[PDB]
Design a protein around this ligand. Sequence first.
Ligand SMILES: C[NH+](C)c1c(Cc2cccc3ccccc23)cc(=O)n2c1SC[C@@H]2C(=O)O
Ligand SMILES: C[NH+](C)c1c(Cc2cccc3ccccc23)cc(=O)n2c1SC[C@H]2C(=O)O
Ligand SMILES: C[NH+](C)c1c(Cc2cccc3ccccc23)cc(=O)n2c1SC[C@H]2C(=O)O
Lengths: 230, 236
Amino acid sequence: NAQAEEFKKYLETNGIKPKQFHKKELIFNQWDPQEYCIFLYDGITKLTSISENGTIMNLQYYKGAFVIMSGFIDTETSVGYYNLEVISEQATAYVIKINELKELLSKNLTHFFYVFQTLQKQVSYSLAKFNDFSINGKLGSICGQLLILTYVYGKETPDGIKITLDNLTMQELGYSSAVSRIISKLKQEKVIVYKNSCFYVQNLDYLKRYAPKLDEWFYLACPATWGKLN
Amino acid sequence: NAQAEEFKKYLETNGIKPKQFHKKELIFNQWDPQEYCIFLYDGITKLTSISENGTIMNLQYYKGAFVIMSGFIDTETSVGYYNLEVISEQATAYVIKINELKELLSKNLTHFFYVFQTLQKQVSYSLAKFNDFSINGKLGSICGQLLILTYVYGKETPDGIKITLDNLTMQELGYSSGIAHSSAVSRIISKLKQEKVIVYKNSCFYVQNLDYLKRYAPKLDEWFYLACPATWGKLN
Ligand SMILES: C[NH+](C)c1c(Cc2cccc3ccccc23)cc(=O)n2c1SC[C@@H]2C(=O)O
Ligand SMILES: C[NH+](C)c1c(Cc2cccc3ccccc23)cc(=O)n2c1SC[C@H]2C(=O)O
Ligand SMILES: C[NH+](C)c1c(Cc2cccc3ccccc23)cc(=O)n2c1SC[C@H]2C(=O)O
């Protein structure tokens, strides 16, 4: 991603320095009264919300390079009480106070447009995800998530599509009752298979059949990556 | 909405005239190759997508003032295949081509931030709605939409909180006796009816207990307080 490297070098040249985070660590939390703009350069993270009773809830996965903002760019107040947890072994992120961003982007429109499109990709991602759930319920969601993992971390192999994620990260993503009924169909219809410490997805058309709008979304958002396995 | 007004005259100054749309008109369709930035200034609209079977899907409702963009501002490629239909009897929207938008935002960054914020509000809206659904399922979704409709179109009258919205508009949002409902949905609205949530009085819709809606949709209430605090403070 060229636009991300240009943004990376733009932050370093403006004083903001990278920071390393390890698994289970929170780049920001739902109680911090200071809102930030996170430029997750590398690593996989997880947006969570904790109910006042202690319930944990996952709300979105992010991978670098990408931007995650916990405050509004103008009012600088919270967009919502969330945490950003690192899910992978480690991750690199440029923490930026929400106030320092308005200047960093006011001095450069190319990077301003770059941050803008990250939001648009979330909006269009959400609409596609709400669509596939409206048609296939939880089946469309599960298939949707697998579909994206296959496009991003899948490599063509003579025996399926090798998901290049360590088994620990795969388990952190979800690998009850109706869920048991779903994953059984996936293991039955030759969708996903576990072979020699590696995950392989073979019936990709099954994932596309039940997550259609998400397949469209990834085609228009990451066309280069989409064409590799299509 | 101050930023909306400021953004309106700014568009008119640069030669962008308002355009009127009637109910059932499409501000744009999925097959239009031109990417747009719809600045809906007044009215109500829905974003729709067509499935393979041909079944239309309601994905999102919009009200002015608000922004809806069909192309990525950087690559200028489409974000998806959507239609934008009018729901109210009339609607005012400033249609702007993707290229002409970058020229406008590059001149004045104040409006860039306004549009930037509108997307942020939409991003956190979905996360909150999904959060309420994960906690309360369909019940959270129903109370969520009713909660927002109350904060936006609700006026605290002696007879409760009146939802200032035409009956035919409410009918287009799925609020009318005789609509095709699911068994589970039927039992939810039945309880909402019994416990006085939405009532049909003087042919107008009122909201008796606001606490019930707030209880089973807390994340949307949290969202609306952070996104639209001025409107949230009215009924609190
Ligand atoms: C909110 N949305 C992005 C969404 C959806 C779509 C969705 C489902 C049900 C109700 C919704 C209401 C509003 C907006 C989106 C909704 C599904 C999903 O599984 N996940 C998400 S976030 C992460 C989670 C997932 O991938 O499992
Ligand atoms: C933030 N969302 C919208 C997202 C995702 C989410 C996602 C879905 C399913 C599995 C994931 C695993 C790790 C990280 C994110 C995941 C993916 C994605 O590729 N992009 C995006 S934005 C564009 C694209 C990208 O990272 O380039
Ligand atoms: C675009 N969404 C996120 C939305 C909506 C949509 C909406 C939700 C629930 C019921 C509706 C009924 C009619 C039209 C739109 C609805 C409303 C809203 O006020 N805001 C937003 S963003 C913040 C706020 C606003 O316009 O100020």
